Amino acid sequence: KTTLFCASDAKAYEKEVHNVWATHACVPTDPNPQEMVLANVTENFNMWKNDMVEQMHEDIISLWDESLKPCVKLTGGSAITQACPKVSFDPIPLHYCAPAGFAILKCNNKTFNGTGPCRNVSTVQCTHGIKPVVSTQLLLNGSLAEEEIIIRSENLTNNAKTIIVHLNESVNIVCTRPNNIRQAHCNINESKWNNTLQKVGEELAKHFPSKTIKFEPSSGGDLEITTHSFNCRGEFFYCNTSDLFNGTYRNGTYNHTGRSSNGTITLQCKIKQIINMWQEVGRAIYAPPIEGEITCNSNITGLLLLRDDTETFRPGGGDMRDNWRSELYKYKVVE
Ligand SMILES: CNCc1ccc2c(c1)N(C(=O)OCCC(F)(F)F)[C@H](CNC(=N)N)[C@H]2NC(=O)C(=O)Nc1ccc(Cl)c(F)c1
Ligand SMILES: *[C@@H]1O[C@H](CO)[C@@H](O)[C@H](O)[C@H]1NC(C)=O
Ligand SMILES: *[C@@H]1O[C@H](CO)[C@@H](O)[C@H](O)[C@H]1NC(C)=O
Ligand SMILES: *[C@@H]1O[C@H](CO)[C@@H](O)[C@H](O)[C@H]1NC(C)=O
Numbered sequence: 001k002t003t004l005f006c007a008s009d010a011k012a013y014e015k016e017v018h019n020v021w022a023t024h025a026c027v028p029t030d031p032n033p034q035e036m037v038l039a040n041v042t043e044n045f046n047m048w049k050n051d052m053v054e055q056m057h058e059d060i061i062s063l064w065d066e067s068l069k070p071c072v073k074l075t076g077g078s079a080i081t082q083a084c085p086k087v088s089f090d091p092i093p094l095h096y097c098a099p100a101g102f103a104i105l106k107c108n109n110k111t112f113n114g115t116g117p118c119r120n121v122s123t124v125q126c127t128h129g130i131k132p133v134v135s136t137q138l139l140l141n142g143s144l145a146e147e148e149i150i151i152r153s154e155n156l157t158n159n160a161k162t163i164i165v166h167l168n169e170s171v172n173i174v175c176t177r178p179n180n181i182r183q184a185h186c187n188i189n190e191s192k193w194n195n196t197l198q199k200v201g202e203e204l205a206k207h208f209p210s211k212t213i214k215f216e217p218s219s220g221g222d223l224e225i226t227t228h229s230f231n232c233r234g235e236f237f238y239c240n241t242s243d244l245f246n247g248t249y250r251n252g253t254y255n256h257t258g259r260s261s262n263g264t265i266t267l268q269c270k271i272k273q274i275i276n277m278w279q280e281v282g283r284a285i286y287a288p289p290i291e292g293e294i295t296c297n298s299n300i301t302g303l304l305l306l307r308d309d310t311e312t313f314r315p316g317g318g319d320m321r322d323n324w325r326s327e328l329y330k331y332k333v334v335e
Protein backbone atom coordinates (compact mmCIF):
# COMPACT_ATOMS: atom_id res chain seq x y z
CA LYS A 1 0.00 0.00 0.00
CA THR A 2 3.09 2.15 0.62
CA THR A 3 6.88 1.97 0.26
CA LEU A 4 8.59 0.01 3.05
CA PHE A 5 12.16 0.38 4.26
CA CYS A 6 14.69 -2.26 5.28
CA ALA A 7 16.49 -2.76 8.59
CA SER A 8 19.54 -5.00 9.10
CA ASP A 9 22.56 -5.96 11.19
CA ALA A 10 24.80 -5.21 8.31
CA LYS A 11 28.28 -3.97 9.03
CA ALA A 12 29.90 -1.09 7.33
CA TYR A 13 33.14 -3.07 7.85
CA GLU A 14 32.04 -6.35 6.37
CA LYS A 15 33.13 -6.43 2.78
CA GLU A 16 30.59 -9.22 2.33
CA VAL A 17 28.36 -7.83 -0.36
CA HIS A 18 25.01 -8.28 1.41
CA ASN A 19 26.52 -6.28 4.28
CA VAL A 20 27.78 -3.54 1.95
CA TRP A 21 24.44 -3.22 0.19
CA ALA A 22 22.48 -3.14 3.43
CA THR A 23 24.73 -0.47 4.95
CA HIS A 24 23.90 1.74 1.96
CA ALA A 25 20.24 0.74 1.75
CA CYS A 26 18.93 -0.25 5.18
CA VAL A 27 18.69 1.37 8.61
CA PRO A 28 19.82 -0.37 11.81
CA THR A 29 17.40 -2.71 13.50
CA ASP A 30 15.64 -1.68 16.65
CA PRO A 31 17.06 -3.69 19.57
CA ASN A 32 13.71 -4.41 21.24
CA PRO A 33 10.74 -4.17 18.88
CA GLN A 34 7.11 -3.65 19.85
CA GLU A 35 4.65 -6.40 18.90
CA MET A 36 1.04 -6.01 19.74
CA VAL A 37 -1.35 -8.87 20.00
CA LEU A 38 -5.01 -8.80 18.86
CA ALA A 39 -6.70 -12.24 18.98
CA ASN A 40 -10.22 -10.83 18.68
CA VAL A 41 -9.53 -9.09 15.40
CA THR A 42 -9.30 -11.81 12.70
CA GLU A 43 -8.29 -10.25 9.39
CA ASN A 44 -7.74 -11.53 5.86
CA PHE A 45 -4.45 -12.26 4.14
CA ASN A 46 -3.30 -13.39 0.72
CA MET A 47 0.35 -14.40 0.34
CA TRP A 48 -0.06 -14.67 -3.44
CA LYS A 49 -0.90 -10.97 -3.83
CA ASN A 50 1.35 -9.07 -1.40
CA ASP A 51 3.08 -5.78 -2.26
CA MET A 52 5.79 -6.69 0.25
CA VAL A 53 6.86 -9.46 -2.12
CA GLU A 54 7.33 -7.00 -5.01
CA GLN A 55 9.22 -4.50 -2.87
CA MET A 56 11.58 -7.23 -1.63
CA HIS A 57 12.02 -8.62 -5.14
CA GLU A 58 13.09 -5.17 -6.29
CA ASP A 59 15.53 -4.86 -3.40
CA ILE A 60 17.19 -8.22 -4.06
CA ILE A 61 17.47 -7.45 -7.78
CA SER A 62 19.23 -4.23 -6.83
CA LEU A 63 21.47 -6.07 -4.36
CA TRP A 64 22.50 -8.54 -7.07
CA ASP A 65 23.41 -5.63 -9.47
CA GLU A 66 25.54 -4.05 -6.79
CA SER A 67 27.03 -7.33 -5.72
CA LEU A 68 27.31 -10.10 -8.35
CA LYS A 69 28.19 -8.23 -11.50
CA PRO A 70 28.45 -10.57 -14.52
CA CYS A 71 31.35 -10.21 -16.87
CA VAL A 72 28.77 -10.18 -19.65
CA LYS A 73 25.00 -9.73 -19.54
CA LEU A 74 22.87 -10.46 -22.63
CA THR A 75 19.32 -9.17 -22.71
CA GLY A 76 17.41 -8.76 -25.95
CA GLY A 77 19.84 -7.57 -28.56
CA SER A 78 22.29 -6.01 -26.14
CA ALA A 79 25.40 -7.35 -24.45
CA ILE A 80 26.64 -5.38 -21.44
CA THR A 81 30.18 -5.91 -20.23
CA GLN A 82 31.68 -4.89 -16.89
CA ALA A 83 34.18 -5.93 -14.27
CA CYS A 84 33.22 -9.18 -12.52
CA PRO A 85 35.48 -9.54 -9.47
CA LYS A 86 35.11 -12.48 -7.12
CA VAL A 87 33.40 -11.35 -3.91
CA SER A 88 32.55 -12.59 -0.44
CA PHE A 89 28.93 -13.64 -0.55
CA ASP A 90 26.81 -14.89 2.35
CA PRO A 91 23.18 -13.74 2.69
CA ILE A 92 22.25 -11.78 5.81
CA PRO A 93 18.73 -11.35 7.20
CA LEU A 94 16.74 -8.29 6.11
CA HIS A 95 13.73 -6.85 7.94
CA TYR A 96 10.97 -5.04 6.07
CA CYS A 97 9.50 -2.13 8.01
CA ALA A 98 6.33 -0.06 7.68
CA PRO A 99 6.96 3.71 7.47
CA ALA A 100 5.35 6.26 9.81
CA GLY A 101 1.54 6.03 9.74
CA PHE A 102 1.67 2.45 8.50
CA ALA A 103 1.86 -0.85 10.32
CA ILE A 104 2.54 -4.47 9.47
CA LEU A 105 0.05 -7.06 10.65
CA LYS A 106 1.37 -10.53 11.36
CA CYS A 107 -0.83 -13.63 11.31
CA ASN A 108 -0.11 -15.58 14.51
CA ASN A 109 -2.09 -18.74 13.59
CA LYS A 110 0.62 -21.38 13.47
CA THR A 111 -1.13 -23.39 10.72
CA PHE A 112 -2.16 -20.51 8.46
CA ASN A 113 -1.81 -21.57 4.85
CA GLY A 114 -1.21 -18.04 3.48
CA THR A 115 -4.81 -17.42 2.36
CA GLY A 116 -8.02 -16.26 3.93
CA PRO A 117 -8.93 -15.25 7.48
CA CYS A 118 -6.57 -15.40 10.46
CA ARG A 119 -7.97 -15.14 13.98
CA ASN A 120 -4.96 -14.17 16.11
CA VAL A 121 -3.25 -11.07 14.64
CA SER A 122 -0.43 -8.77 15.75
CA THR A 123 0.87 -5.34 14.73
CA VAL A 124 4.62 -4.81 14.26
CA GLN A 125 7.16 -2.32 12.97
CA CYS A 126 9.02 -4.86 10.90
CA THR A 127 9.00 -8.43 9.70
CA HIS A 128 11.34 -10.97 11.13
CA GLY A 129 14.77 -11.22 9.57
CA ILE A 130 14.56 -12.85 6.13
CA LYS A 131 17.69 -14.03 4.35
CA PRO A 132 17.21 -13.38 0.60
CA VAL A 133 18.33 -16.82 -0.58
CA VAL A 134 18.02 -17.36 -4.34
CA SER A 135 17.38 -21.01 -5.32
CA THR A 136 15.08 -23.40 -7.23
CA GLN A 137 13.54 -26.73 -6.04
CA LEU A 138 14.65 -26.41 -2.42
CA LEU A 139 14.05 -23.43 -0.16
CA LEU A 140 17.22 -22.99 1.92
CA ASN A 141 17.87 -21.33 5.26
CA GLY A 142 14.27 -20.21 5.74
CA SER A 143 12.24 -20.31 8.92
CA LEU A 144 10.45 -23.54 9.78
CA ALA A 145 6.70 -23.88 10.38
CA GLU A 146 6.17 -24.15 14.12
CA GLU A 147 3.55 -26.96 14.16
CA GLU A 148 2.73 -29.00 11.09
CA ILE A 149 4.08 -29.08 7.55
CA ILE A 150 2.02 -26.46 5.66
CA ILE A 151 0.97 -26.73 2.01
CA ARG A 152 0.56 -23.36 0.29
CA SER A 153 -0.76 -22.70 -3.20
CA GLU A 154 -2.63 -19.92 -4.91
CA ASN A 155 -4.94 -22.68 -6.21
CA LEU A 156 -4.22 -26.38 -5.58
CA THR A 157 -6.68 -27.44 -8.28
CA ASN A 158 -4.66 -25.49 -10.87
CA ASN A 159 -1.64 -27.65 -11.64
CA ALA A 160 0.18 -24.63 -13.16
CA LYS A 161 0.29 -22.88 -9.75
CA THR A 162 3.44 -23.44 -7.73
CA ILE A 163 3.08 -25.33 -4.43
CA ILE A 164 5.18 -24.23 -1.46
CA VAL A 165 5.79 -26.89 1.17
CA HIS A 166 6.72 -25.32 4.51
CA LEU A 167 8.63 -27.87 6.57
CA ASN A 168 8.50 -28.07 10.37
CA GLU A 169 11.84 -29.88 10.50
CA SER A 170 14.87 -28.88 8.46
CA VAL A 171 16.92 -31.28 6.36
CA ASN A 172 20.65 -30.67 6.19
CA ILE A 173 22.22 -30.42 2.74
CA VAL A 174 26.00 -30.08 2.45
CA CYS A 175 27.30 -29.01 -0.95
CA THR A 176 30.98 -28.81 -1.75
CA ARG A 177 33.36 -28.42 -4.65
CA PRO A 178 36.49 -30.02 -3.21
CA ASN A 179 39.98 -28.75 -3.15
CA ASN A 180 37.37 -31.18 -13.06
CA ILE A 181 36.97 -28.10 -11.03
CA ARG A 182 33.33 -27.39 -11.97
CA GLN A 183 32.56 -30.78 -10.34
CA ALA A 184 30.77 -30.76 -6.99
CA HIS A 185 28.36 -32.77 -4.92
CA CYS A 186 25.75 -32.47 -2.17
CA ASN A 187 25.06 -34.94 0.64
CA ILE A 188 21.68 -35.40 2.32
CA ASN A 189 21.01 -37.97 5.04
CA GLU A 190 18.56 -40.48 3.52
CA SER A 191 16.82 -41.10 6.88
CA LYS A 192 15.64 -37.49 7.15
CA TRP A 193 14.87 -37.10 3.51
CA ASN A 194 12.87 -40.28 3.87
CA ASN A 195 10.90 -39.14 6.93
CA THR A 196 10.16 -35.70 5.53
CA LEU A 197 8.77 -36.98 2.26
CA GLN A 198 6.60 -39.44 4.18
CA LYS A 199 5.24 -36.48 6.15
CA VAL A 200 4.89 -34.23 3.08
CA GLY A 201 3.13 -37.09 1.32
CA GLU A 202 0.70 -37.41 4.23
CA GLU A 203 -0.28 -33.71 3.99
CA LEU A 204 -0.47 -33.84 0.21
CA ALA A 205 -2.74 -36.87 0.62
CA LYS A 206 -5.04 -34.87 2.88
CA HIS A 207 -5.50 -32.54 -0.09
CA PHE A 208 -5.70 -35.33 -2.74
CA PRO A 209 -7.12 -38.31 -0.86
CA SER A 210 -8.03 -41.00 -3.40
CA LYS A 211 -4.76 -40.72 -5.27
CA THR A 212 -1.36 -42.33 -4.77
CA ILE A 213 1.26 -39.57 -4.21
CA LYS A 214 4.49 -39.76 -6.21
CA PHE A 215 7.60 -37.57 -6.31
CA GLU A 216 9.54 -37.55 -9.58
CA PRO A 217 12.33 -35.37 -11.02
CA SER A 218 11.79 -32.22 -13.01
CA SER A 219 10.70 -33.17 -16.51
CA GLY A 220 12.22 -30.36 -18.53
CA GLY A 221 13.15 -26.72 -18.88
CA ASP A 222 16.29 -24.72 -18.37
CA LEU A 223 18.95 -26.25 -16.20
CA GLU A 224 18.29 -23.71 -13.43
CA ILE A 225 14.89 -25.31 -12.77
CA THR A 226 15.57 -28.93 -13.72
CA THR A 227 18.31 -28.98 -11.08
CA HIS A 228 18.53 -27.54 -7.60
CA SER A 229 20.38 -24.34 -8.46
CA PHE A 230 21.72 -21.85 -5.94
CA ASN A 231 24.67 -19.54 -5.25
CA CYS A 232 27.36 -20.74 -2.82
CA ARG A 233 30.07 -18.18 -1.88
CA GLY A 234 29.58 -16.43 -5.26
CA GLU A 235 29.62 -19.58 -7.42
CA PHE A 236 26.49 -20.89 -9.18
CA PHE A 237 25.83 -24.56 -8.31
CA TYR A 238 23.50 -26.78 -10.37
CA CYS A 239 22.73 -30.00 -8.48
CA ASN A 240 20.95 -33.03 -9.95
CA THR A 241 17.95 -34.06 -7.84
CA SER A 242 16.95 -37.24 -9.72
CA ASP A 243 17.75 -39.24 -6.59
CA LEU A 244 15.91 -36.80 -4.34
CA PHE A 245 12.48 -36.39 -5.96
CA ASN A 246 12.09 -40.11 -6.58
CA GLY A 247 9.60 -41.94 -4.42
CA THR A 248 6.07 -43.16 -3.90
CA TYR A 249 3.67 -42.59 -1.00
CA ARG A 250 1.15 -45.40 -1.51
CA ASN A 251 -0.93 -46.39 1.40
CA GLY A 252 0.05 -44.47 4.50
CA THR A 253 3.70 -45.30 3.70
CA TYR A 254 6.52 -43.67 1.71
CA ASN A 255 8.97 -45.76 -0.37
CA HIS A 256 12.09 -43.99 -1.57
CA THR A 257 12.81 -44.95 -5.22
CA GLY A 258 15.95 -42.83 -5.48
CA ARG A 259 19.28 -44.53 -5.09
CA SER A 260 21.47 -44.02 -2.02
CA SER A 261 24.64 -45.49 -0.52
CA ASN A 262 25.67 -45.72 3.13
CA GLY A 263 22.32 -44.09 3.89
CA THR A 264 23.35 -40.86 2.16
CA ILE A 265 21.87 -39.40 -1.01
CA THR A 266 24.56 -37.72 -3.08
CA LEU A 267 23.73 -35.14 -5.72
CA GLN A 268 26.12 -34.54 -8.59
CA CYS A 269 26.58 -30.79 -9.13
CA LYS A 270 28.30 -28.61 -11.69
CA ILE A 271 29.46 -25.02 -11.15
CA LYS A 272 28.41 -23.04 -14.20
CA GLN A 273 29.41 -19.74 -15.75
CA ILE A 274 26.55 -19.12 -18.21
CA ILE A 275 23.48 -18.38 -16.08
CA ASN A 276 19.87 -17.91 -17.12
CA MET A 277 18.92 -14.95 -14.96
CA TRP A 278 16.16 -14.96 -12.39
CA GLN A 279 15.89 -11.14 -12.44
CA GLU A 280 14.88 -10.77 -16.11
CA VAL A 281 14.77 -12.82 -19.26
CA GLY A 282 18.48 -12.91 -20.10
CA ARG A 283 21.88 -14.57 -19.78
CA ALA A 284 24.76 -13.63 -17.49
CA ILE A 285 28.35 -14.86 -17.84
CA TYR A 286 30.67 -15.04 -14.81
CA ALA A 287 34.35 -15.88 -14.38
CA PRO A 288 35.60 -19.43 -13.60
CA PRO A 289 35.50 -20.73 -10.02
CA ILE A 290 37.63 -19.41 -7.20
CA GLU A 291 40.18 -21.87 -5.98
CA GLY A 292 40.10 -24.21 -3.02
CA GLU A 293 37.10 -25.79 -1.34
CA ILE A 294 33.73 -24.16 -1.91
CA THR A 295 31.30 -25.48 0.68
CA CYS A 296 27.83 -24.44 1.85
CA ASN A 297 26.13 -26.19 4.78
CA SER A 298 22.45 -25.37 4.44
CA ASN A 299 19.09 -26.28 5.93
CA ILE A 300 16.32 -27.28 3.56
CA THR A 301 13.32 -25.58 5.13
CA GLY A 302 10.80 -25.82 2.28
CA LEU A 303 10.09 -27.24 -1.14
CA LEU A 304 8.78 -25.83 -4.42
CA LEU A 305 6.60 -28.38 -6.24
CA LEU A 306 4.44 -28.60 -9.36
CA ARG A 307 1.62 -31.10 -9.91
CA ASP A 308 1.15 -32.93 -13.20
CA ASP A 309 -5.56 -42.77 -9.86
CA THR A 310 -2.25 -40.97 -9.17
CA GLU A 311 -1.09 -37.40 -8.50
CA THR A 312 2.57 -36.87 -9.20
CA PHE A 313 4.73 -33.99 -7.91
CA ARG A 314 7.94 -32.62 -9.43
CA PRO A 315 10.27 -29.92 -8.10
CA GLY A 316 9.70 -26.42 -9.41
CA GLY A 317 10.99 -22.89 -9.08
CA GLY A 318 12.22 -20.14 -11.33
CA ASP A 319 10.24 -17.18 -10.04
CA MET A 320 12.17 -15.89 -7.05
CA ARG A 321 9.11 -14.05 -5.72
CA ASP A 322 7.83 -17.43 -4.53
CA ASN A 323 10.93 -17.66 -2.35
CA TRP A 324 10.06 -14.29 -0.83
CA ARG A 325 6.42 -15.39 -0.46
CA SER A 326 7.50 -18.38 1.57
CA GLU A 327 8.74 -15.99 4.25
CA LEU A 328 6.36 -13.06 3.81
CA TYR A 329 3.13 -15.08 3.77
CA LYS A 330 2.15 -14.05 7.32
CA TYR A 331 2.53 -10.29 6.84
CA LYS A 332 0.42 -7.49 5.39
CA VAL A 333 0.84 -3.69 5.29
CA VAL A 334 -2.04 -1.68 6.67
CA GLU A 335 -3.38 1.86 7.17
C1 LIG B 1 7.45 -20.25 -11.84
N1 LIG B 1 7.94 -21.20 -12.82
C2 LIG B 1 7.98 -20.59 -14.13
C3 LIG B 1 9.40 -20.02 -14.39
C4 LIG B 1 10.45 -20.88 -14.75
C5 LIG B 1 11.74 -20.40 -14.98
C6 LIG B 1 12.00 -19.04 -14.89
C7 LIG B 1 10.96 -18.15 -14.52
C8 LIG B 1 9.67 -18.65 -14.29
N2 LIG B 1 11.55 -16.85 -14.49
C9 LIG B 1 10.88 -15.70 -13.89
O1 LIG B 1 9.81 -15.79 -13.38
O2 LIG B 1 11.49 -14.47 -13.91
C10 LIG B 1 10.94 -13.51 -13.06
C11 LIG B 1 10.15 -12.52 -13.90
C12 LIG B 1 10.81 -12.22 -15.25
F1 LIG B 1 11.84 -11.34 -15.12
F2 LIG B 1 11.21 -13.36 -15.86
F3 LIG B 1 9.89 -11.57 -16.01
C13 LIG B 1 12.87 -16.75 -15.00
C14 LIG B 1 12.90 -15.99 -16.37
N3 LIG B 1 14.30 -15.68 -16.66
C15 LIG B 1 14.90 -16.24 -17.84
N4 LIG B 1 14.23 -16.94 -18.65
N5 LIG B 1 16.29 -15.99 -18.10
C16 LIG B 1 13.31 -18.19 -15.07
N6 LIG B 1 14.02 -18.45 -13.90
C17 LIG B 1 15.46 -18.50 -13.93
O3 LIG B 1 16.05 -18.33 -14.93
C18 LIG B 1 16.24 -18.76 -12.65
O4 LIG B 1 15.68 -19.00 -11.63
N7 LIG B 1 17.67 -18.74 -12.77
C19 LIG B 1 18.52 -18.92 -11.63
C20 LIG B 1 19.76 -18.33 -11.75
C21 LIG B 1 20.66 -18.38 -10.69
C22 LIG B 1 20.27 -19.02 -9.53
CL1 LIG B 1 21.37 -19.11 -8.14
C23 LIG B 1 19.02 -19.56 -9.41
F4 LIG B 1 18.68 -20.15 -8.24
C24 LIG B 1 18.11 -19.50 -10.44
C1 LIG C 1 -6.15 -22.16 2.45
O1 LIG C 1 -7.17 -21.96 3.40
C2 LIG C 1 -8.34 -21.35 2.84
C3 LIG C 1 -9.28 -21.10 3.99
O2 LIG C 1 -8.66 -20.24 4.95
C4 LIG C 1 -8.94 -22.26 1.78
O3 LIG C 1 -10.04 -21.58 1.17
C5 LIG C 1 -7.90 -22.59 0.72
O4 LIG C 1 -8.44 -23.55 -0.17
C6 LIG C 1 -6.63 -23.12 1.38
N1 LIG C 1 -5.59 -23.35 0.39
C7 LIG C 1 -4.75 -24.38 0.49
C8 LIG C 1 -3.71 -24.48 -0.59
O5 LIG C 1 -4.83 -25.20 1.40
C1 LIG D 1 5.31 -31.93 11.21
O1 LIG D 1 4.21 -32.06 10.31
C2 LIG D 1 3.89 -33.43 10.00
C3 LIG D 1 2.75 -33.41 9.01
O2 LIG D 1 2.11 -32.15 8.94
C4 LIG D 1 3.59 -34.24 11.27
O3 LIG D 1 3.42 -35.62 10.93
C5 LIG D 1 4.71 -34.09 12.30
O4 LIG D 1 4.35 -34.71 13.52
C6 LIG D 1 4.97 -32.61 12.52
N1 LIG D 1 5.94 -32.35 13.58
C7 LIG D 1 7.25 -32.62 13.62
C8 LIG D 1 7.85 -33.41 12.48
O5 LIG D 1 7.93 -32.27 14.57
C1 LIG E 1 -8.79 -22.88 -8.87
O1 LIG E 1 -8.81 -24.08 -9.70
C2 LIG E 1 -9.49 -24.12 -10.97
C3 LIG E 1 -8.44 -23.84 -12.02
O2 LIG E 1 -8.33 -24.97 -12.88
C4 LIG E 1 -10.72 -23.21 -11.07
O3 LIG E 1 -11.86 -23.92 -10.59
C5 LIG E 1 -10.56 -21.91 -10.30
O4 LIG E 1 -9.56 -21.10 -10.91
C6 LIG E 1 -10.15 -22.22 -8.89
N1 LIG E 1 -11.08 -23.14 -8.28
C7 LIG E 1 -11.21 -23.25 -6.96
C8 LIG E 1 -12.13 -24.31 -6.48
O5 LIG E 1 -10.63 -22.49 -6.19
Ligand SMILES: *[C@@H]1O[C@H](CO)[C@@H](O)[C@H](O)[C@H]1NC(C)=O
Pocket residue numbers: 223226227240241242
Ligand atom coordinates in the same frame (compact mmCIF):
# COMPACT_ATOMS: atom_id res chain seq x y z
C1 LIG F 1 20.29 -36.06 -13.66
O1 LIG F 1 20.98 -37.32 -13.74
C2 LIG F 1 20.25 -38.32 -14.46
C3 LIG F 1 21.03 -39.61 -14.36
O2 LIG F 1 22.20 -39.42 -13.58
C4 LIG F 1 20.04 -37.87 -15.90
O3 LIG F 1 19.29 -38.85 -16.60
C5 LIG F 1 19.31 -36.54 -15.91
O4 LIG F 1 19.18 -36.08 -17.25
C6 LIG F 1 20.05 -35.51 -15.07
N1 LIG F 1 19.30 -34.27 -15.04
C7 LIG F 1 19.83 -33.11 -15.42
C8 LIG F 1 18.92 -31.93 -15.36
O5 LIG F 1 21.00 -33.02 -15.78
Ligand SMILES: *[C@@H]1O[C@H](CO)[C@@H](O)[C@H](O)[C@H]1NC(C)=O
Pocket residue numbers: 216217242243246257258259
Ligand atom coordinates in the same frame (compact mmCIF):
# COMPACT_ATOMS: atom_id res chain seq x y z
C1 LIG G 1 15.09 -42.94 -9.47
O1 LIG G 1 16.48 -43.32 -9.34
C2 LIG G 1 16.87 -44.43 -10.17
C3 LIG G 1 18.32 -44.72 -9.85
O2 LIG G 1 18.85 -43.80 -8.90
C4 LIG G 1 16.66 -44.08 -11.63
O3 LIG G 1 16.95 -45.23 -12.41
C5 LIG G 1 15.23 -43.64 -11.88
O4 LIG G 1 15.10 -43.17 -13.22
C6 LIG G 1 14.81 -42.53 -10.91
N1 LIG G 1 13.39 -42.24 -11.08
C7 LIG G 1 12.91 -41.37 -11.97
C8 LIG G 1 11.42 -41.24 -12.03
O5 LIG G 1 13.65 -40.70 -12.69
Ligand SMILES: *[C@@H]1O[C@H](CO)[C@@H](O)[C@H](O)[C@H]1NC(C)=O
Pocket residue numbers: 090091133140141230231232295296297298299
Ligand atom coordinates in the same frame (compact mmCIF):
# COMPACT_ATOMS: atom_id res chain seq x y z
C1 LIG H 1 22.78 -21.17 4.74
O1 LIG H 1 23.25 -20.64 6.02
C2 LIG H 1 24.54 -21.10 6.44
C3 LIG H 1 24.82 -20.45 7.78
O2 LIG H 1 24.64 -19.04 7.72
C4 LIG H 1 25.59 -20.76 5.39
O3 LIG H 1 26.84 -21.30 5.80
C5 LIG H 1 25.17 -21.37 4.07
O4 LIG H 1 26.12 -21.10 3.05
C6 LIG H 1 23.80 -20.85 3.66
N1 LIG H 1 23.42 -21.40 2.37
C7 LIG H 1 23.17 -20.61 1.31
C8 LIG H 1 22.86 -21.32 0.03
O5 LIG H 1 23.17 -19.39 1.40
